[PDB]
Design a protein around this ligand. Structure first.
Ligand code: MG
Length: 574
């Protein structure tokens, strides 16, 4: 039914530069809208639409696991078509087309904590430079799409665009138009996988250049796992639990869709504080003027006609933006620390020390944060105070917790192995005579992510094999699949084009022991396994289906090998 959304008033946040909309006329015209809007969204404002056109498994990994596909689909979460435009628009309306809560009483306290963190980072680490070309080359996804506004340049993917060097002039053109107040290439494209939003490739490279340094501060933070591999997370979870004794690990449903323009105004305020010069601050501020006023093209289908629909929102966070992870991590830390401080009655004059202590992993409160994922660690007495009322503050901000009633008290976790962080739990695994906590999740999810993405298909599989060996060797079916992947993929591929210490053809256990025990242990035989008794549930039961797959893996490896040079890794196991 034909709806005309009325947005609430905007928050006015003292001490912060407002994120005024840009002049979008040029960027809107670049999308070549044809018809006036239908208006069937409740929050997003439709500007117009045009007639469009309806928008596999890696062969190496996929064939290696094929004998297991049945048990993985039945007993695990492997789960294996393109989403129709009808379904795309239905999931946009269900999940994205929801107004953020702009108006609440928490901005002054949130600002205080953003300011404290910014002053701490500046005091200890200095201000933030734009990324260098070399840093940008390390961070790009070479397989990223170009965007409708860039499709008629025929680059294929980001990697080809990057190699051509043409982006150098385009990024400067993007910058100048943006700073004029009338950007080019500022309308988001979307694809369905959830719905991924992304600016054109030139805009994405500019974002990375300006805001990509935020990751460097996060690497210094004891509440962040930025730059650290998954094999380190369990020990961090254990260390945090040992100093506290109780954990609260709650997810927000659709975190990205709930971030307000008010929260974005705070992010911008903080990041301009960090910028290296005044022009950079203006660039960051102008990027956030774009972010807080997102325009995007989403598909739909009515009466058999496929539409490309131009929609305008307010606030929210787009997923296909490289700085998003770092900005999400910071805002998740601040909103969580704020709600905890207010709920526990920590006086505001102690908030600078509180944020320093969280950052230094000192005291008996700890956080671990990655994107929208967080675990809060507290002593039992404070955990009970937190669990019974901190949700009121996040509810006030629209940060509603997933899969629980609105005012349900938080579950207090007291067993380190029940803490979920970054979609894993962590179990103690023996390396020689020491213990390290290593990640586990449903093996169907592990295998699916290793399977669903030329010589880059082979290089991609090989990197999945190296990653699986490093992170999941303690799960027997994962170590086995990893060794099979490394036996069927050829030596000499460019893995770095596709995670530096171990991205090598000559990877050996000494590299893995260096990452986990700093080389106190050695050899294949000191790489631990989970106990046989626990090989069930999320892990593959070691029955005849597993054993037959293992039996036929050497033959399958020989059949999948082609003209390359290979080594036999399956003999490293049994
Ligand atoms: Mg969590």
């Amino acid at each position: 039914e034909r709806i005309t959304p009325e947005w609430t008033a905007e928050a006015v946040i003292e001490g912060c530069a407002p994120l005024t909309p840009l002049n979008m006329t040029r960027s809107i015209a670049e999308m070549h809208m044809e018809y006036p809007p239908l208006g069937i969204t409740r929050f997003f404002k439709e500007l117009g639409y045009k007639i469009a056109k309806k928008k596999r498994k890696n062969r190496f990994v996929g064939q290696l696991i094929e004998p297991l596909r049945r048990v993985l689909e039945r007993h695990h979460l492997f789960g294996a078509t393109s989403t129709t435009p009808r379904a795309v628009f239905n999931m946009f309306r269900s999940k994205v087309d929801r107004a953020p809560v702009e108006l609440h009483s928490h901005y002054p306290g949130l600002k205080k904590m953003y300011d404290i963190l910014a002053d701490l980072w500046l005091e200890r680490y200095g201000s933030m430079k734009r990324l260098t070309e070399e840093e940008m080359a390390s961070a790009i996804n070479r397989r990223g799409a170009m965007g409708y506004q860039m499709d008629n340049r025929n680059y294929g993917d980001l990697g080809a665009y990057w190699d051509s060097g043409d982006w150098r002039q385009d990024v400067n053109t993007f910058k100048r138009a943006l700073l004029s107040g009338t950007p080019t290439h500022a309308v988001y494209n979307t694809t369905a996988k959830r719905i991924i939003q992304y600016l054109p490739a030139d805009a994405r490279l500019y974002e990375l250049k300006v805001l990509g340094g935020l990751h460097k501060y996060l690497e210094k933070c004891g509440w962040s796992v930025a730059g650290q591999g998954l094999y380190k997370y369990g020990d961090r979870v254990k260390k945090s639990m040992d100093a506290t004794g109780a954990a609260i690990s709650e997810d927000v449903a659709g975190w990205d869709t709930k971030i307000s323009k008010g929260l974005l105004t705070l992010e911008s305020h903080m990041f301009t504080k960090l910028a290296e010069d005044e022009e950079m601050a203006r660039e960051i501020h102008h990027l956030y003027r774009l972010y807080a006023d997102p325009h995007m093209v989403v598909q739909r289908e009515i009466e058999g006609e496929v539409h490309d629909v131009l929609l305008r929102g307010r606030g929210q966070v787009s997923s296909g933006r490289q700085p998003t992870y770092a900005a999400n991590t910071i805002t998740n830390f601040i909103t969580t620390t704020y709600g905890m401080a207010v709920t526990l009655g920590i006086p505001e004059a102690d908030w600078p020390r509180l944020i320093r202590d969280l950052t230094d992993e000192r005291g008996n409160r700890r956080l671990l944060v990655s994107g929208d994922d967080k675990v809060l660690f507290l002593r039992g007495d404070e955990a009970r105070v937190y669990a019974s009322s901190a949700y009121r503050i996040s509810n006030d901000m629209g940060l509603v917790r997933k899969d629980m009633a609105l005012e349900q008290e938080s579950e207090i976790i007291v067993d380190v192995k029940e803490i979920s962080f970054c979609s894993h739990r962590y179990w103690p695994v023996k390396y020689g005579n020491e213990i390290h906590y290593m990640p586990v999740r449903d093996v169907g999810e592990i295998f699916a992510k290793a399977t669903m993405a030329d010589m880059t298909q082979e290089a991609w599989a090989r990197v999945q094999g190296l990653n699986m060996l490093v992170n999941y060797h303690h799960i027997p079916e994962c170590r086995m699949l990893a060794l099979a992947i490394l036996s069927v993929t050829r030596i000499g591929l460019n893995l770095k084009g596709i995670s530096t210490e171990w991205l090598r053809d000559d990877l050996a256990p000494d590299t893995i022991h260096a990452l986990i025990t700093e080389g106190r242990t050695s050899g294949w035989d000191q790489l631990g396994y989970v106990d046989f008794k626990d090989r069930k549930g999320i892990l593959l039961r070691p029955d005849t289906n597993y054993k037959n797959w293992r039996r036929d893996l050497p033959e399958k490896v020989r059949q999948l090998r082609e003209d390359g040079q290979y080594k036999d890794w399956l003999q490293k196991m049994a």
